[PDB]
Amino acid sequence: ILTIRLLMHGKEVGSIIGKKGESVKRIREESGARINISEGNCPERIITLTGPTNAIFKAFAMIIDKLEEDIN
Amino acid sequence: ILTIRLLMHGKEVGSIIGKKGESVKRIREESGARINISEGNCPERIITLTGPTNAIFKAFAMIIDKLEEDI
DNA sequence: CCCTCCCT
């Protein structure tokens, strides 16, 4: 059970929270991680990833994949 | 003693109970109304309010303010 | 693109 913080620009975050909140809703329900995204229109936002190794991995990889398809 | 039912989306209602449970704690205590909330992840939830016009009015106003800020 | 918040 480990935690890892990811830094993220404003626009970056919006992608992980696709219109209506589903994008996270997958990543969450699909990796098994505890995912939190500090709110408030702040230029830099933390996304905390919390859980066992593979859960993190999975959440990470989906996060990566989401941003990967946003260039630009 | 009046009963007034409030239809409420699943998102909204989660804000009234905000966190461990304290948001309702606040309103139950500080408004002095009989507040009930239907249970389970149903999209559509009822909040019954029983009491005097005062308590009903208090509770309601406390709800609106929890809602107003989200936003 | 803003997400969940579990109370008698």
Swiss-Prot record, chain A:
Phosphorylated; lowers poly(rC)-binding activity. It is found in: Nucleus; Cytoplasm. Abundantly expressed in skeletal muscle, thymus and peripheral blood leukocytes while a lower expression is observed in prostate, spleen, testis, ovary, small intestine, heart, liver, adrenal and thyroid glands. It comes from the Eukaryota. Residues 2-63 form the KH domain. Single-stranded nucleic acid binding protein that binds preferentially to oligo dC. Together with PCBP2, required for erythropoiesis, possibly by regulating mRNA splicing. (Microbial infection) In case of infection by poliovirus, plays a role in initiation of viral RNA replication in concert with the viral protein 3CD. This is Poly(rC)-binding protein 1. It comes from Homo sapiens (Human). The lineage of its organism: Eukaryota, Metazoa, Chordata, Craniata, Vertebrata. The gene is PCBP1. The chain holds residues 14 to 84 of 356 of the full protein.
